Amino acid sequence: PRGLGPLQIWQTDFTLEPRMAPRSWLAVTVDTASSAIVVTQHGRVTSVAVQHHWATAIAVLGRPKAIKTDNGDAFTSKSTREWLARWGIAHTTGAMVCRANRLLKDKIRVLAEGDGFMKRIPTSKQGELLAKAMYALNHKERGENTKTPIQKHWRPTVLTEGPPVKIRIETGEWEKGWNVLVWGRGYAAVKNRDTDKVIWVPSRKVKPDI
Amino acid sequence: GLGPLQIWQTDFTLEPRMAPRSWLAVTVDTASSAIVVTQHGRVTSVAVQHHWATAIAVLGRPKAIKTDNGDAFTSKSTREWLARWGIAHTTGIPGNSQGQAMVCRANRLLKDKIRVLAEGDGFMKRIPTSKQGELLAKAMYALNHKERGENTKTPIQKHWRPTVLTEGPPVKIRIETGEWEKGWNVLVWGRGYAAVKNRDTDKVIWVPSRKVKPDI
Question: Nearest chain B Cα to A137, which residue?
């Protein structure tokens, strides 16, 4: 689902960006902890393309412990499975990367239109424009956040232990014995005190214990 | 000089293993020694601008870049590009010391790594086109995320000064008196409370939102 610190869990997807035609496939990875994004451009959705993409992302961000994707063949082929195994990266199929895709496309749109490109970006200007978008997204604050994704990526805040909370389970009851490690707007990461098991739950199902 | 993102050096070097895009644009941050490379079919103003935009996306925006006096660096297109980005630029003789020595060393490091990685994947001459991008990325990973020689710090460490922070910003809390007490750091916020940790006692408590303020 989500990492507690950077380079734990990434999410990756392909998305189509007609402004970047003819090579309009963008491979997008987001680090689920820092929100930093890496994007590369490709002519086709293939196993080879995703391998190049991840190698690029690793060069920028460092090597993750695990990557989550959908069921698509580029991600689950023998070639890609052996590639991930070689790099020692766990893989799951089955979101943050969806929001990353939207932010990226909005940014590409703003930058292109700013250069007078209402439709297709001229082929020779595409690489530069994509890099500019990536710079804006990683090196500038995301809306209301006080730190940029790249700052959160290299200097993350990771609580060693959190404060005690109760969580609402199933019987409608509130259960003690949990501590909160991350408390965001939508979700919270909570750890069971007896096992150190960590689960993600909606914020509304968590409240301070005492 | 001292400090990352102050002075970069950029050069183009030929790497026939990377044909047909055998011109490698190479930038090194002279403080952190971090290297970024992109490949190009020819040395043009467009290639230079793609390269620097890429390097900036990876490393951040530098104050200044030093290059030789090739037409791609001194063109009107590139002059105006640099100006739009607010980056200072100085040119020199190709190979010159004060502005090209470090990037010359980076060229050799990079080409040695490309050779070792390629021959390691069983490619003794030209690297298959479909494998080139990945191999360049792997070379950047190896050059930036591992220590150069006797260094205790990797270029990534010098560039970003990584660390893990274990608490949020300092805060002060309103205690029973009306006094605002310093010596606390916030851990998380939720449901109208802040969880705060006392720097001196390590006590962690939940405090109503309205009774917590940032400390200076």
Answer: B57
